[PDB]
Amino acid sequence: NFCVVELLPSDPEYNTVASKFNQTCSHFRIEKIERIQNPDLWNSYQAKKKTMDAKNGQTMNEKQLFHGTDAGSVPHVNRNGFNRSYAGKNAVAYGKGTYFAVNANYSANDTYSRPDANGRKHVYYVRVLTGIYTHGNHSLIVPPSKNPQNPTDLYDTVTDNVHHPSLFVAFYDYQAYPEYLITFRK
């Protein structure tokens, strides 16, 4: 269960999100930005953030990233977040989880934010608990262990490039909160 508030171009949140989107997608046309309010998903996410904060020390565990999807997946995502059934439909090259882009222009590709019948594209601005990350590979359904001494001490997410990331993979729904849906067109 969830609700969705459309933000007005005059609200600080709209402008914050638009600004970040527009850093690589200015030449596209924003039609609306919606804030997604899903209590259970948000409660689960904040619980995961508390334990991750008390584990990774000084690490800034949270990044805001982009996720392009088809119109048909918006209801499933607003309702159950980036759950396993959704990840099944994501790429594999860096593991079997949900894929998130540092730059909007990556997520805006038609391959990901597929234009619907009316030419409308959908990209989420997502809160993701990236935590401590390592290089991903095709065989992962969860991040590797850091050490063999402790095989239950896992990296929090994986990436294409640890020092210069372009994307991150999350393997659990409670690691990614879809705060904002950007609806836009070419």
CB of 27 to ligand YFG, least distance (A): 18
Is the C-alpha dihedral spanning 63, 177, 17, 95 positive or negative? positive
Q: Which of 61, 90, 157, 183 touches ligand YFG (CB under 6 A)?
A: 90
Q: Is the CB of residue 185 less than 8 Å from the CB of residue 31?
A: yes
Q: Which of 8, 47, 93, 141 touches ligand YFG (CB under 6 A)?
A: 93
And the tokens for 40? 């259970």
**Taking the CA atoms of the chain, what radius of gyration do you get in angstroms?**
16
Q: How far apart are CA 130 and CA 159, in angstroms?
A: 9
Q: Is 167 a binder of ligand YFG (CB under 6 A)?
A: yes
CB of 115 to ligand YFG, least distance (A): 12
Q: In sequence order, which residues have a C-beta less than 8 Å from that of residue 137 and are 6 or more positions away? A: 94, 95, 158
Considering only residues 105 to 134 of the shown chain, the ones binding ligand YFG according to CB under 6 A are 106-107, 112, 114
Considering only residues 30 to 89 of the shown chain, the ones binding ligand YFG according to CB under 6 A are 66-70, 73, 89
CB of 82 to ligand YFG, least distance (A): 9
Q: Which of 90, 174, 179 is nearest to 131 (CA)?
A: 174
And the tokens for 142? 């969860």
Q: Give the number of residues in contact with ligand YFG, rule: CB under 6 A.
A: 18
Which is nearer to ligand YFG, 95 or 131 (by Cβ)? 95
- Share in percent of the chain as helix, strand, coil (round to 5): 25, 30, 40
CB of 65 to ligand YFG, least distance (A): 9
CB of 35 to ligand YFG, least distance (A): 19
* Residue ranges binding ligand YFG (CB under 6 A): 66-70, 73, 89-91, 93-94, 99, 101, 106-107, 112, 114, 167
